[PDB]
Amino acid sequence: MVNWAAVVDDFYQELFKAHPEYQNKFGFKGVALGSLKGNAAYKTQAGKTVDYINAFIGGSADAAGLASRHKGRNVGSAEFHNAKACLAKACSAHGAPDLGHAIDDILSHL
Numbered sequence: 643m644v645n646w647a648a649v650v651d652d653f654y655q656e657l658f659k660a661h662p663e664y665q666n667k668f669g670f671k672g673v674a675l676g677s678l679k680g681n682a683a684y685k686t687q688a689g690k691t692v693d694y695i696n697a698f699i700g701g702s703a704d705a706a707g708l709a710s711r712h713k714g715r716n717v718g719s720a721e722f723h724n725a726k727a728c729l730a731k732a733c734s735a736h737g738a739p740d741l742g743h744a745i746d747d748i749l750s751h752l
């Protein structure tokens with residue numbers, strides 16, 4: 643099993659390093675990046691992100707649903723294009739398969 647939890651941790655490190663303002667939309671707003679792994683809100687959110695990646699690989703991802711929910715947080719195409727870059731770095735850092743197609747599916751509904 644690819645260590646998707648580790649990939650997602652690296653993903654959020656890249657994401658909030660590049661776009662620290664994105665963190666303000668989450669229950670772990672203002673938490674130092676080096677302490678995220680000890681934050682209960684983050685632990686829940688990272689778990690869901692892992693779940694989505696496993697659902698994509700598994701054939702069950704609902705990209706329309708995920709898209710609609712992100713629009714509900716005023717998160718759109720710009721942000722997801724940024725996330726694509728970050729996720730590609732995280733995957734590559736772990737010798738994991740690239741997830742660009744999953745992000746493209748979400749982007750198709752944004």
Ligand code: HEM
Nearest residue numbers: 664665667668669690691694711715717721722725726729
């Ligand atoms: C690699 C791209 C991303 C994936 C796979 C992803 C995945 C997810 C998942 C699975 C959820 C939970 C949805 C649910 O419970 O139904 C979520 C929620 C959320 N996402 Fe993302 N996301 C991505 C990018 C982003 C970006 C770039 C932002 C920018 C701020 C963002 C902001 C949020 C926020 C604010 C929530 C709600 C959190 C809460 O309930 O407190 N996401 N995301």
